[PDB]
Design an enzyme around this catalytic site. Structure first.
Site, PDB file in Angstrom:
ATOM      1  N   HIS A  40       0.771  -1.360  -0.052  1.00 49.78           N
ATOM      2  CA  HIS A  40       0.009  -0.057   0.044  1.00 49.78           C
ATOM      3  C   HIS A  40       0.998   1.381   0.173  1.00 49.78           C
ATOM      4  CE1 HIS A  40       0.299   0.032   4.557  1.00 49.78           C
ATOM      5  NE2 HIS A  40       0.085   1.119   4.426  1.00 49.78           N
ATOM      6  N   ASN A  54      16.912  12.621  11.806  1.00 50.30           N
ATOM      7  CA  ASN A  54      16.030  14.055  11.758  1.00 50.30           C
ATOM      8  C   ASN A  54      15.702  13.928  10.148  1.00 50.30           C
ATOM      9  OD1 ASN A  54      14.881  16.391  10.970  1.00 50.30           O
ATOM     10  ND2 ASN A  54      15.847  17.439  13.105  1.00 50.30           N
ATOM     11  N   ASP A  84       0.345  -7.613   1.816  1.00 48.97           N
ATOM     12  CA  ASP A  84       0.929  -6.350   1.859  1.00 48.97           C
ATOM     13  C   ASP A  84       2.243  -6.153   1.951  1.00 48.97           C
ATOM     14  OD1 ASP A  84       0.634  -3.693   1.775  1.00 48.97           O
ATOM     15  OD2 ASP A  84       0.063  -3.455   3.929  1.00 48.97           O
ATOM     16  N   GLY A 175       1.874   7.064   8.681  1.00 43.57           N
ATOM     17  CA  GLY A 175       3.475   7.586   8.379  1.00 43.57           C
ATOM     18  C   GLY A 175       4.469   6.301   8.814  1.00 43.57           C
ATOM     19  N   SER A 177       3.636   3.093   8.153  1.00 42.21           N
ATOM     20  CA  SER A 177       3.290   2.143   7.261  1.00 42.21           C
ATOM     21  C   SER A 177       4.604   1.882   6.352  1.00 42.21           C
ATOM     22  CB  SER A 177       2.318   2.489   6.292  1.00 42.21           C
ATOM     23  OG  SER A 177       1.015   2.416   6.696  1.00 42.21           O
ATOM     24  N   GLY A 178       4.689   0.449   6.085  1.00 38.67           N
ATOM     25  CA  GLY A 178       5.833  -0.337   5.561  1.00 38.67           C
ATOM     26  C   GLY A 178       6.999  -0.371   6.281  1.00 38.67           C
TER      27      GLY A 178
HETATM   28 CA   LIG Z   1      18.096  14.009   8.154  1.00 42.23          CA
END
Ligand SMILES: [Ca+2]
Ligand SMILES: N=C(N)c1ccc([C@H]2[C@H]3C(=O)N(Cc4ccc5c(c4)OCO5)[C@@H](Cc4ccccc4)[C@H]3[C@@H]3CCCN32)cc1
Length: 223
Positions: A40, A54, A84, A175, A177-178
């Site tokens: 997905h 970061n 999936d 966010g 996901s995967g």
């Molecule tokens: Ca970075």
């Protein structure tokens, strides 16, 4: 990640961000030229970002590499999210180092109660939204079959497992996901779905990576 903690820069060196002008999904590095993610998460124009902490600042140790191919499981079903899983080949091999490293495929499925590490840059709010700059971690047990299926009757295939907490407050989320679910040094899971995030009796559902090791190896070998 909801109810998680700051991992620490590069403490999860197999963790990858999929970027298309923004972070949209996680993934796991399984060799210098292949990442494992969710079907997905498929889209065109994927840039793989390795060595990230970061995600909004260039700190050093980053490698940005475009995907040369993205291979969705041919049996992926978008309605039920069975199968999936997706393979992404990098345009060029990553340079592996302490901060950019592969995670091992399992040799055996994991059992209920096994403790795993789940990580991502996804939403950190059960309700509402807050996306972190730095990588979040969550320790989570794999739940039993019956518990899982009791949580989500007729929604759980043999290619899925539940991990997490039925009391709420701690889950993967949007966010994430995967991204990886790693247990005892093995990639056993991929963030796939759930009902909201960190809601009581609605635990996280994960792609059962031990069912795909053969597929993964044959697909990589042929591409
Ligand atoms: Ca970075
Ligand atoms: N609570 C979680 N840990 C969690 C993790 C990931 C997502 C994802 C996926 C999701 O929930 N989809 C919808 C869905 C719902 C029910 C169902 C599905 C799919 O297949 C069989 O039964 C999709 C993604 C969506 C993308 C943004 C984050 N969501 C949700 C919760």
């Amino acid at each position: 990640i909801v109810g998680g903690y700051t991992c620490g820069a590069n403490t999860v060196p197999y963790q990858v961000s999929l970027n298309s002008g923004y972070h949209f999904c996680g993934g796991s590095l399984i060799n210098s030229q292949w990442v494992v993610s969710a079907a997905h998460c498929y889209k065109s124009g994927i840039q793989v970002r390795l060595g990230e902490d970061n995600i909004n600042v260039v700190e050093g140790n980053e490698q940005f590499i475009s995907a040369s191919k993205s291979i969705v499981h041919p049996s992926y079903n978008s309605n039920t999210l069975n199968n999936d899983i997706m393979l992404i080949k990098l345009k060029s091999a990553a340079s592996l180092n302490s901060r950019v490293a592969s995670i091992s495929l399992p040799t055996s499925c994991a059992s209920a109660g096994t403790q795993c590490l789940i990580s991502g840059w996804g939403n950190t709010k059960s309700s509402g939204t807050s996306y972190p700059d730095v990588l979040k971690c969550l320790k989570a047990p794999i739940l039993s079959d019956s518990s899982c299926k009791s949580a989500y009757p007729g929604q759980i295939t043999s290619n899925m497992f539940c991990a997490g907490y039925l009391e709420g407050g701690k889950d993967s989320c949007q966010g994430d996901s995967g991204g990886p679910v790693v247990c005892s040094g093995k990639l056993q899971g991929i963030v796939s779905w759930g009902s909201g995030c960190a809601q009581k009796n609605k635990p996280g559902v994960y792609t059962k990576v031990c069912n795909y090791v053969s597929w993964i190896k044959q697909t990589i070998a042929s591409n």
